[PDB]
Amino acid sequence: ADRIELRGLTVHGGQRFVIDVTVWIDLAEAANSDDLADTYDYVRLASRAAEIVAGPPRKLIETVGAEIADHVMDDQRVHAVEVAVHKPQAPIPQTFDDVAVVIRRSRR
Amino acid sequence: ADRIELRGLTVHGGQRFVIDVTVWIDLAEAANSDDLADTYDYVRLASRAAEIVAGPPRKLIETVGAEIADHVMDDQRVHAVEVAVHKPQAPIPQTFDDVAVVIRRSRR
Amino acid sequence: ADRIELRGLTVHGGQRFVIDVTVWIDLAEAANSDDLADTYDYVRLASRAAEIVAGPPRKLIETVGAEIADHVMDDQRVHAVEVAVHKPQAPIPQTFDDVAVVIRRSRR
Amino acid sequence: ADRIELRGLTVHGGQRFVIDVTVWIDLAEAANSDDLADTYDYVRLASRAAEIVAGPPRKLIETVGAEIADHVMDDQRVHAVEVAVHKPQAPIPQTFDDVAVVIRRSRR
């Protein structure tokens, strides 16, 4: 039913990568959280994603997506995640402005 | 079949919150309404949402969404609602530009 | 499988209405058409929609959508249509920037 | 599960055509690729699409979509493709700003 949508994280290897993540996950009780990030910590997600991408050049666009996806899935409360990694292209004519892989995972 | 899409309500606690609501609901007869808001009163929805958010600081982003969602669902003509609350982020590098919870409800 | 997406028709009653239409419909043979509009005539659709909206003030936002929808459905080749009528709001704080009804029809 | 989203290829016959393609297709092993384009070569896709559109004027908007779609489908690793060809309209009042055909194919 409920999801969290994280848009427009700009991370560098530099060549820009723009990342979006959707996380399907039950919202914690109001009684138990002092922020959204207590249900789902998109703060540590954004650091981890910045490290993954900044790391030893071994940085394939789908590899970033798959690692982000699995990282999110480590947390057994996530029913499913959808991770988009966009490499915005230098604007040269007859090419795509934007190329993105979108990775999905879910358990059920 | 038919829905009403309400985009871009900016409400303050201040920190901006941008809210969208979709409402699935049968449209009233042309014979009986003098405006859209007679099918679904997005005018009172926008006040109520501005009060909820402006209120005694106790304002969690998911709490706003859940309350909006339940408020809309009070009206038994609504088959389902989808409420997005967006907290547009101060633009600091390696963070998400936008973080949003999206709440869904439906009866059937 | 195949659809035609018509975005951003601005029509006046004046207060602006912005209309989008999607039409699900089998594409005609290359052998038989000299334009897209020979499969689906979005030219006459845009006139008709401009007349409907410009007409004797009796112009409800859902009424426009329903009439557009039925008009498109008159053509028995259409499997389904989705018509969005948007009334972009004067920007006053704590209100929705945009309010839209979206109408769907399909036969099967 | 996994898809590749290619947005905003501007191609000329001139009248601009803006093309998007989504490709559903299993991502190759990290072990075997040095780029995304090794899973799916959107580089040759963008040339081919620019040739198709630039070619002997015989250029219907749905014909471009269908040819792109079939071309992508030639590669038996693609589970499905969705090709949008947009002809952005000269902005004349009471007409659609944008008219697009969207073609889908899939095997299963």
Swiss-Prot record, chains A, B, C, D:
GO terms for biological process: folic acid biosynthetic process; tetrahydrofolate biosynthetic process. GO terms for cellular component: cytoplasm; encapsulin nanocompartment. Substrate binds at residues 42, 61-62. Keywords: Encapsulin nanocompartment, Folate biosynthesis, Isomerase, Lyase, Oxidoreductase. SMART domains: FolB. It is found in: Encapsulin nanocompartment. Possible cargo protein of a type 1 encapsulin nanocompartment involved in protection against oxidative stress. Catalyzes the conversion of 7,8-dihydroneopterin to 6-hydroxymethyl-7,8-dihydropterin, 7,8-dihydromonapterin and 7,8-dihydroxanthopterin, respectively, in equal quantities. After longer incubation times the only product is 6-hydroxymethyl-7,8-dihydropterin. Retains aldolase activity when encapsulated with a slight decrease in rate. It is not known if this protein is normally found in the encapsulin nanocompartment. PANTHER family: DIHYDRONEOPTERIN ALDOLASE 1-RELATED. Was identified as a high-confidence drug target. The C-terminus (residues 119-133) targets the protein to the encapsulin nanocompartment. Belongs to the DHNA family. This is Dihydroneopterin aldolase.
